[PDB]
Swiss-Prot record, chain A:
MF-aspect GO terms: cytokine activity; protein heterodimerization activity; protein homodimerization activity
Highest classification ranks of the organism: Eukaryota, Metazoa, Chordata, Craniata, Vertebrata
Post-translational modification: N-glycosylated. Found both in glycosylated and nonglycosylated forms.
Gene that this polypeptide is encoded by: IL17A
Sites carrying sugar chains: D14
Record's protein name: Interleukin-17A
UniProtKB/Swiss-Prot annotation, chain B:
Family: Belongs to the IL-17 family.
Protein name listed in UniProt: Interleukin-17A
First-to-last residue of the parent protein present: 42 to 149 of 155
The keyword Cell membrane appears for this protein: no
Organism expressing this protein natively: Homo sapiens
Keyword Glycoprotein: yes
Amino acid sequence: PRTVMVNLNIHYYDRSTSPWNLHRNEDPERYPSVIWEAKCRHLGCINADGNVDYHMNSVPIQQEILVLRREPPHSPNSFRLEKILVSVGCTCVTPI
Amino acid sequence: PRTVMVNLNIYDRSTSPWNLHRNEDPERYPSVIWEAKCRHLGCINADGNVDYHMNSVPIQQEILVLRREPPHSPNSFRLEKILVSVGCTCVTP
Ligand SMILES: C[C@H]1NC(=O)[C@H](Cc2ccc(NC(=O)[C@@H](NC(=O)Cc3ccccc3)C3CCCCC3)cc2)NC(=O)CC2(CCCC2)CC(=O)N[C@H](C(=O)O)CCCCNC1=O
């Protein structure tokens, strides 16, 4: 394995045609504990007229992203990096 | 001040489409970060052309990153916080 020391002390989108809100997920077995991800606010995208148009799709932009899982489980001071997927926002796409 | 141990062993149809810019810092983990850059200023018509009645804007986000301490160090870092462009959405002015 590849062990390193890390020190833990450290160093508007409403206009969108595919707007979104944030939802909460807590896991006290990883850092950061509490993660907010984007859930699209509608299924279609917004018109110049201001109506939802279901011939277009709001879809979540899914990013790959690293976190620390306690290893062993329930450890204050030792971890691995795990790779997870997280919604950072939504964009409007042309369907199939 | 508090030190821990870490094992390092782990679309294109958008009206506001984006690209990939590469960002590489030898003093960083990870050293390779792929940022987003919007391809256009405006967004894509039903006609498949670009009109400037809407705007393409990046989605900025704060992330944590490993900065070598001391510098040039193979096995010792501290957390550092940066902005990164992580996608592009179409927005109304
Ligand atoms: C929007 C919402 N915030 C969230 O939910 C998101 C969730 C998030 C989770 C994980 C990450 N991953 C990383 O950064 C990791 N990097 C990478 O993968 C590197 C990378 C980059 C690009 C491409 C590939 C890979 C690092 C890797 C090393 C281990 C640590 C994590 C990012 C975001 N961000 C927060 O919580 C804020 C942060 C995390 C970013 C800096 C500060 C934690 C904090 O100090 N949060 C503050 C706190 O604790 O008080 C503020 C909390 C309230 C605000 N929260 C909110 O409103």
